[PDB]
Design a protein around this ligand. Sequence first.
Ligand SMILES: Nc1ncnc2c1ncn2[C@@H]1O[C@H](COP(=O)(O)OP(=O)(O)OP(=O)(O)O)[C@@H](O)[C@H]1O
Ligand SMILES: [Mg+2]
Length: 107
Amino acid sequence: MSIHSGRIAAVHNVPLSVLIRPLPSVLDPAKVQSLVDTIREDPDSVPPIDVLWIKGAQGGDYFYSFGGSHRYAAYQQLQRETIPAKLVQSTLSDLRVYLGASTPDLQ
Ligand SMILES: Nc1ncnc2c1ncn2[C@@H]1O[C@H](COP(=O)(O)OP(=O)(O)OP(=O)(O)O)[C@@H](O)[C@H]1O
Ligand SMILES: [Mg+2]
């Protein structure tokens, strides 16, 4: 009778450089290193990080990253070009939950 409907999410290898990280990270250096070790020997055991995928007023794609901080840090320390990310389609109102009056008028 019924179906489940929701926002589109898709896992991709996303260049680290395109992830916008507005806020500072709180990091346990031990956990970053444990993650670096895991990524090196068993990357499949490290899930994709969740990323807001926002399309702006004129169709620009923007990728906002808030969580996944330890994984993000670990991929940076490995000088990786990309990171596995679950791109979750999100609206500017979704973004405003994080950014409030600082939310950009994305184009
Ligand atoms: N060696 C490891 N150390 C920590 N987490 C690991 C490790 N290997 C795999 N994982 C997995 O990676 C994910 C890490 O998520 P977690 O929420 O702990 O940190 P984060 O999201 O990267 O950073 P934060 O939550 O601080 O923003 C979890 O799914 C965990 O099971
Ligand atoms: Mg987390």
